[PDB]
Design a protein around this motif. Structure first.
Motif, PDB file in Angstrom:
ATOM      1  N   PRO A  56       0.838  -1.211   0.000  1.00 48.59           N
ATOM      2  CA  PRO A  56       0.000   0.000   0.000  1.00 48.59           C
ATOM      3  C   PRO A  56       0.863   1.246   0.000  1.00 48.59           C
ATOM      4  CG  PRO A  56      -0.641  -1.470   1.793  1.00 48.59           C
ATOM      5  CD  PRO A  56       0.534  -2.100   1.128  1.00 48.59           C
ATOM      6  N   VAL A  57       0.484   2.223  -0.819  1.00 49.62           N
ATOM      7  CA  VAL A  57       1.261   3.460  -0.907  1.00 49.62           C
ATOM      8  C   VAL A  57       0.395   4.699  -0.719  1.00 49.62           C
ATOM      9  CG1 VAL A  57       3.017   2.500  -2.400  1.00 49.62           C
ATOM     10  CG2 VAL A  57       0.995   3.582  -3.432  1.00 49.62           C
ATOM     11  N   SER A  58       1.074   5.815  -0.463  1.00 48.40           N
ATOM     12  CA  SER A  58       0.503   7.158  -0.638  1.00 48.40           C
ATOM     13  C   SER A  58       1.386   7.912  -1.674  1.00 48.40           C
ATOM     14  CB  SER A  58       0.436   7.930   0.696  1.00 48.40           C
ATOM     15  OG  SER A  58      -0.264   9.186   0.503  1.00 48.40           O
ATOM     16  N   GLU A  60       3.897  10.214  -1.374  1.00 49.57           N
ATOM     17  CA  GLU A  60       5.346  10.295  -1.146  1.00 49.57           C
ATOM     18  C   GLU A  60       6.080   8.972  -1.441  1.00 49.57           C
ATOM     19  OE1 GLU A  60       6.883  13.401  -0.559  1.00 49.57           O
ATOM     20  OE2 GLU A  60       4.774  13.992  -0.935  1.00 49.57           O
ATOM     21  N   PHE A 357      -7.822   3.281  -3.286  1.00 53.62           N
ATOM     22  CA  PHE A 357      -6.751   2.467  -3.872  1.00 53.62           C
ATOM     23  C   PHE A 357      -6.056   3.085  -5.068  1.00 53.62           C
ATOM     24  CE2 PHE A 357     -10.147  -0.593  -2.407  1.00 53.62           C
ATOM     25  CZ  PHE A 357      -9.618  -0.732  -1.136  1.00 53.62           C
ATOM     26  N   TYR A 360      -3.064   9.047  -3.988  1.00 53.32           N
ATOM     27  CA  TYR A 360      -3.580  10.155  -3.163  1.00 53.32           C
ATOM     28  C   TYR A 360      -4.752   9.689  -2.284  1.00 53.32           C
ATOM     29  CZ  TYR A 360      -0.932  13.869  -5.676  1.00 53.32           C
ATOM     30  OH  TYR A 360       0.031  14.648  -6.240  1.00 53.32           O
ATOM     31  N   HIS A 361      -5.573   8.791  -2.825  1.00 53.25           N
ATOM     32  CA  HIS A 361      -6.742   8.277  -2.115  1.00 53.25           C
ATOM     33  C   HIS A 361      -6.280   7.207  -1.124  1.00 53.25           C
ATOM     34  CE1 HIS A 361      -8.828  10.134  -5.575  1.00 53.25           C
ATOM     35  NE2 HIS A 361      -9.936  10.081  -4.865  1.00 53.25           N
ATOM     36  N   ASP A 362      -5.522   7.631  -0.119  1.00 52.32           N
ATOM     37  CA  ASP A 362      -4.761   6.718   0.728  1.00 52.32           C
ATOM     38  C   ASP A 362      -5.512   6.214   1.962  1.00 52.32           C
ATOM     39  OD1 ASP A 362      -4.531   8.906   2.476  1.00 52.32           O
ATOM     40  OD2 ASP A 362      -2.500   9.404   1.867  1.00 52.32           O
ATOM     41  N   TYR A 363      -6.783   6.586   2.095  1.00 55.13           N
ATOM     42  CA  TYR A 363      -7.598   6.153   3.243  1.00 55.13           C
ATOM     43  C   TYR A 363      -8.847   5.345   2.897  1.00 55.13           C
ATOM     44  CZ  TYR A 363      -9.899  10.650   2.287  1.00 55.13           C
ATOM     45  OH  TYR A 363     -10.534  11.690   1.628  1.00 55.13           O
TER      46      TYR A 363
END
Ligand SMILES: [Cl-]
Ligand SMILES: [Cl-]
Ligand SMILES: [Cl-]
Ligand SMILES: [Cl-]
Lengths: 908, 905
Positions: A56-58, A60, A357, A360-363
């Motif tokens: 899983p990424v964001s 950065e 997913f 940027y849509h990290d939540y």
């Protein structure tokens, strides 16, 4: 510096793409494979919150993590080389003027990265896409080409770093959960199937399996594997410079090897190859998520056999071409037409990602909210209308008997989940959007009978719009509202709608506008539940009540229905029928609402009254007239500088939010949009609002801001003000609200102003130097002009809808086709035409507007209309023309039927 | 090629240190700065779960994340260069045979990374440490040296990537929360103070501030800054190859600049400098966490002024030298003696990290568990005893009236938090460890009166050892057990202890051993609460009951106490005093326990009985004798091959866990340790157990395993079996249990066997080629021989304690000093000596054992004992010799007093 369209189907190319931070592109299917891919092949791959194949990424992570998808070539005389440029060596050329030539090309729905090693005479091209099959699978094809004068000797290694578990484990028990890994190698690759899962679900047995498989173009299996990440990278290594590749080690493992307890990498060593000058070799890699151990034989036959990648890519291209060809725009701005095809994709992407997913849509965890249930119907009405009726019916099951609604959406059709544990927020605007969506359906379809279908109401522990807990609720009652004698209460869809809009009317704060509750559409206006008011959405509810009144009289006029069946307790809220209360009294309106709540909690009687449809309409019009006069008389404000507009908000201290203030005028876009859209704003007020918008909100660099600057945090109003100004819900150009502003302007005939707004969104989005995004509309343009939260934004649904139903003006009116062009002269092409292909009443129509006299909007009218090569008579001259639904339905089902609207100048 | 000790204070050096994955070293202070540092300067920096200065990491981050601490030099004619080797360019030399020469040196408590650029003629040395001041601060000093023949022109840039918020935000709302950042530049650096915090606490105003400041050696401020991470790295850049450094850009910001809404980096551009051949320049960087905006002026004066780094490093070295000099071992194995100094540090580290915030320890949030309350007292008793009595007293407040205990520890002294939302686990062994710890205290201190101090009992919604919810419960009852009349009940510490041990005695499963409940010491034996049994800890409770019996008779013999004041309801459980039940009946024992539970739920009466101390002792001995006979008669097992040992467990189907099985014998180490330690195992059984351990558990490559291989998951027993064999609680060499095994062997006089065990832990730990850890004992050695979960392991407390109180045999007996060496001949040095410096009864003693006849253990005895150059009389010949506490206390408080024990045949 930016991307450029190639061809006429929306394909684009971007040179030196990794010279831009944070770029990513989406690959997805209905089966549930959800991927993101960057210019160096980073991103993520997942089938859900608990089943990430890659880490899983964001945002950065896209620069800071070395764990991209990768494919390596060990080139004799040069050494290790990444086909996507993600090696330590290649990355070290960045900012030295020595970077390798590279590109991204992309289309519907696929991605290609190219790179050239000039030193060695080697070119690579790596194509990624998610097949449109029923598997959760992403494919990769790497083609290597000798561009030099002598043979090259190459040793290839695919390397897909694996995660294979819940995002809950990213750090928390990251290492512990690595001990649960079980790796199994077979002929074509590597499977990881953890023995157990430890995440927020608890500790459970796991069967989910994550696979990386590969073959040469001609079908030859890999020579061997490095399945264990620490062994692949080597002691002190990393995934952008792994010892196994860099020192060209012999494989650690062959088929039939099992290894337990270690982080895994899908590292596939292919046989060394001598590549002749001018020749290519290709490799196919498959990334798979399955509910149990993978039938690797079937996957090899279906995905790795010679020719399968190419066939499946053609199937992908045809499927997406078919989805997107339901709406095609054609104008003088060919670039915007192509950019609009990407906008047209976005609503589908939001559905298939569950607004989650992507980096940027990290939540997001992939669910749907209440808003999505209605919003998703917008694009579907235009692109795939078959399921819209069923969705709308199912959605109304979520309404409570106090007009509020369930906020957690379940698995089944019209399934909603009660959370008895967390006291949930009420969003005051949740009751407004359903009628807006439903009205659009009624006007596109003609299906007025939808309004009389029966449906249940949602019921849980929370009553009086979540103000109290019902002591009498039990598990044994179930999640549906009950009658006195224990039966599931059912009311019409129209009953649900009436309730959703009439309750907020009475739920007024100390200044007489409808209470903010836990927020409205701005989820960051969350700190004024006690005394806050959304004047902004009071305008929307005022307009809804007025439209309902008109709707009911039109039902009588068209259906002949003289009666409405409504739960008897709701007669208390239609006070105009019995003993009317004073709508000028906040006390009386709140007291009446309390009597209503008492009457329907815990149960309704189940008795219904049959009420005169005109009398109900009259009640709704009284309410709407009252709200309109109150907003115009009490919430129209002016700054000392002389601009005027509508106040949108009262804060939790009961203070008016908008107007003059130390350090600058405070204004919100949201406070204007629905006032304009719904008619609360007179034409004069709308002209004045637009001046105030342009003065206080329209930024020369970033366009139409959501709000002007409030200095510092605003703890009596909302967490939105903790964000830096120009980002997210604090003063960014927030595409969704800006598009709705434009829609409102077009609705009211402010066409040049509407055009300016829509054109600004496009220009901002397409100004790559600042936006740094691929084709599409972002959630917002930020303080630095950057496009943020790409692809999944609901603004795309509104942009699509507005361009179709307002700009080109092709829309339904009670099932009949209304044509009312609002195109400006600049929008017509070199042949004096602008056209839209669109599906209506189950037929594909190409609506062509001809403006041979090159008249501006306001200077033109509909001179004549022809259909399939024949004259059509229209039941209107002013506004636009109206074509009966029968004439459309009589057309052949196959093919695109041309409808030519000739425009001429006005007389006098 | 491993680390090597340098000098005699435990400093070590490791060449080419980044050639090893996952290495990290700890820097920490009492103020609460908690850091980890790797050979390339990666790791993490935090003051707590919600206040990470650098990004939260796990093990894979140490290679996969580019965001190390960094310091860059832009070298004219060469370009960008990282002093720690973390640049894309330098990383690209790995595995090509072109790597730069580098090293790590470290000590108590500081870390130094060196590197040489041979091409350019430049050397760097970067020293990291956490000052021992009252600030939450880490310092870094980079010294650059021109090793070439001509002047070098260098442009330096420090770069500490910032995170500045809760670990909850790592991915979840990572980007959203970046919008809350507020960056403020001043003369000496960069502050980040988010406007709000969004994490599991909710949405709140934030004042916590994260700072990166710096100066040249002489105090000169930076020339400018790049505070915004995306601007520093540049479009398409990264932290290991950032455009601002690589293209040598002019700074983005000077002092007085504020920037909102972006991820931040402490990137400090220093003025360009011309460095003469042979000469050095140095830079100091400070990383600070504060509750509000930082007084940057004070920090500059205290940390950045000329000479402050060096003075504070000397203060750090002196503070840690002082902490660790409380225990010093000296033997024929000088390397082990030095390695033991690192072991001696570890118990302090566990306290100051809260078993959290190092890369492998990726889930801890810094609190303490019930076990820690007691375990932390072990190292403190020998290193820093002043607060031990208060801690023990406070800890007993957590006991419930059913013998179970609170499992969430609060802020205040003896504060415990009720769980409320989760139905909590009961760990069956939680009641055993307190008496073990407390007995050690009694014997080190002589403070028998501790046993009669009053203390409350913890009370929450959970009753009958969390088997039911109390229907009468409210918030208005409060967190303490009440009497019938409405008063807070208080019972003696001894009453608490008695309850903790007597209740489990009656809480037996279908095969008659004490129920497993939610697990014992192995937290992964969690899937047998219904029918599981821990025979393993039944032995521990049997031994506890026997020691209690002996303790009580010894209390009478010494205190003259003839009476014990005990809550009247507990008389039901001391059934020997009234109408005795049959201990052979599971039904009767469970029924009696139910009657007891009913009597004390929801309240006690508050009436106490005075019971004859001999009669209570007799009851405790009956229980203990019963348990011993039952374990020996029913849980001693044998494999077909002829090895024999104690079964440790029954699973949730009521099946015996250990013994012959398809695919291999099943044996646990835990099932042996307490049987041996406590006397349930006869000497014969202990000999046989040790043979079985060596046969089934002792791996030639990885040492003494926790258990032999059970094939596949074991869902009727525990989640431990979902771990790969040889990792964590499934069959790894789990240091804590292995050390306790050794302790048990030494206790019972199996000294050669005990030695083998302890020596194996050391050898495994110090075999760097496989262990890949710095000096110290890890939580476990894994299937590949790697050391895992470093520094914080409770095994260090046990290793320290065992080496002191069993091997060297310096221990208390009711406050008197007992000396009973269990050193083997090979442990004596070239002068025939082995010694330990240790603090006892408030005095530092150097106990020197002289073995001039080179006798093996078993062949030697104490011939004479002298103190400060004079003969000491001993009140013992057998076991060992015993010195009265008064003779120690009479010694001067300053200095180390030498106590020479001459050994003969
Ligand atoms: Cl190069
Ligand atoms: Cl969700
Ligand atoms: Cl080089
Ligand atoms: Cl914790």
């Amino acid at each position: 510096k930016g991307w450029k369209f190639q061809g006429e189907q929306g394909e684009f190319r971007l040179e030196q793409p990794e010279h831009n931070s944070y770029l990513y592109f989406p690959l997805v299917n209905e089966a549930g494979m959800m991927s993101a891919v960057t210019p160096n092949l980073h991103g993520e791959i997942t089938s859900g919150h608990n089943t990430f194949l890659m880490e899983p990424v964001s945002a950065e992570s896209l620069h800071n993590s070395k764990a991209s998808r990768n494919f390596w070539v060990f080139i004799e005389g040069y050494g290790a080389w990444s086909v996507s440029g993600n090696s330590a060596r290649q990355n070290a050329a960045r900012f030295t003027g020595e970077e390798e030539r590279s590109a991204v090309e992309a289309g519907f729905l696929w991605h290609a990265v190219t790179r050239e090693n000039e030193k060695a005479g080697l070119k690579a091209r790596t194509v990624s896409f998610v097949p449109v099959t029923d598997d959760k699978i992403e494919l990769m094809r790497v083609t290597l080409t000798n561009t030099g004068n002598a043979p090259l000797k190459l040793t290839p290694t695919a390397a897909i770093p694996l995660y294979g578990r819940s995002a809950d484990d990213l750090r928390d028990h990251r290492h512990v959960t690595s001990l649960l890994h079980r790796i199994f190698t077979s002929e074509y690759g590597i499977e990881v199937q953890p023995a157990l899962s430890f995440d927020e679900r608890g500790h459970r047995v796991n069967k989910v399996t994550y696979g990386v498989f590969g073959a040469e173009a001609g079908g030859t299996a890999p020579a061997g594997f490095f399945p264990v990440t620490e062994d692949f990278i080597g002691e002190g290594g990393a995934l952008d410079w792994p010892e196994a590749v860099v020192a060209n080690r012999e494989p650690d493992a062959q088929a039939g090897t099992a290894v337990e307890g270690y982080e895994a990498v899908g590292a596939l060593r292919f046989a060394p190859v001598e590549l002749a000058p001018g020749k290519s070799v290709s490799y196919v890699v498959a990334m798979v998520i399955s509910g149990d151990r993978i039938d690797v034989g079937r996957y090899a036959a279906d995905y790795l056999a010679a020719g399968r990648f190419d066939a499946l890519l053609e199937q992908n291209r045809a499927y997406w071409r078919d989805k997107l060809d339901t709406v095609r725009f054609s104008s003088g701005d060919g670039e915007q037409d192509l950019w609009m095809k990407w906008v047209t994709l976005q609503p589908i992407l939001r559905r298939l990602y569950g607004n989650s997913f992507l980096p940027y849509h990290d939540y997001g965890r992939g669910g749907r909210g209440w808003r999505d249930l209605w919003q998703d119907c917008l694009a579907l009405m235009v692109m795939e209308p078959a399921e819209v009726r069923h969705l709308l019916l199912n959605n109304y099951a979520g309404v409570r008997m106090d007009g509020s609604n369930a906020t957690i959406i379940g698995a089944g059709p019209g399934e909603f989940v009660a959370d008895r544990n967390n006291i949930p927020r009420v969003w005051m605007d949740h009751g407004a959007w359903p009628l807006m969506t439903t009205l659009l359906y009624l006007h596109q379809s003609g299906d007025l009978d939808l309004l009389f279908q029966p449906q249940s109401y949602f019921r849980d522990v929370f009553v009086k719009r979540c103000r109290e807990r019902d002591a009498s609720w039990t598990p044994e009652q179930g999640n549906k509202l009950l009658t006195a004698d224990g039966q599931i209460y059912e009311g019409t869809i129209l009953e649900h709608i009436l309730l959703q809009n009439i309750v907020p009317f009475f739920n007024v704060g100390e200044h007489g506008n409808i209470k903010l509750e836990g927020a409205d559409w701005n989820d960051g206006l969350d700190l004024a539940p006690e005394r806050g008011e959304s004047v902004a959405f009071t305008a929307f509810y005022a307009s809804n009540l007025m439209e309902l009144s008109e709707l009911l009289l039109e039902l009588q006029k068209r259906t002949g229905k003289d009666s409405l069946d409504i739960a008897e307790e709701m007669a208390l809220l239609l006070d105009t029928l019995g003993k009317p209360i004073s709508y000028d009294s906040i006390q009386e309106k709140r007291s009446l609402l309390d009597r209503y709540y008492d009457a329907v909690t815990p149960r309704v009687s189940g008795k219904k009254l049959l009420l005169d449809i005109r009398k109900v309409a009259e009640d709704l019009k009284r309410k709407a007239d009252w709200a309109v006069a109150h907003l115009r008389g009490s919430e129209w404000i002016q700054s000392k500088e002389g601009y005027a507009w509508f106040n949108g908000y009262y804060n939790n201290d009961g203070e008016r939010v908008e107007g003059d203030h130390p350090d600058g005028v405070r204004m919100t876009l949201t406070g204007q949009v629905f006032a304009i859209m719904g008619g609360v704003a007179t034409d004069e007020q709308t002209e004045k609002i637009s001046q105030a918008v342009n003065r206080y909100l329209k930024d020369e660099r970033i366009g139409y801001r959501l709000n002007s600057r409030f200095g510092g945090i605003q703890q009596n109003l909302g967490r939105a003000f903790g964000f830096a100004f120009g980002h997210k819900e604090n003063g960014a150009m927030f595409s969704h609200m800006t598009v709705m502003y434009a829609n409102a302007l077009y609705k009211r005939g402010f066409v040049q102003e509407g055009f300016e707004v829509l054109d600004s969104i496009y220009r901002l989005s397409a100004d790559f130097e600042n936006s740094r995004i691929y084709p599409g509309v972002p959630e917002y343009i930020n303080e630095r002009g950057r496009g943020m939260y790409t692809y999944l934004t609901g603004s795309a649904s509104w942009l699509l809808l507005t361009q179709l139903t307002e700009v080109y003006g092709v829309k339904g009116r009670f099932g009949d086709l209304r044509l009312e062009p609002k195109l400006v002269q600049a929008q017509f092409d070199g042949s004096g035409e602008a056209a839209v292909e669109t599906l209506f009443a189950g037929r594909m129509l190409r609506v062509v507007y001809r403006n041979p006299q090159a008249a501006e909007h306001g200077q033109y009218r509909v001179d004549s209309v022809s259909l399939n090569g024949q004259s059509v008579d229209c039941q209107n001259d002013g506004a636009g023309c109206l074509i009966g639904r029968s004439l459309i339905e009589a057309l052949p089902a196959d093919g695109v039927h041309e409808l030519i609207v000739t425009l001429g100048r006005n007389i006098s």
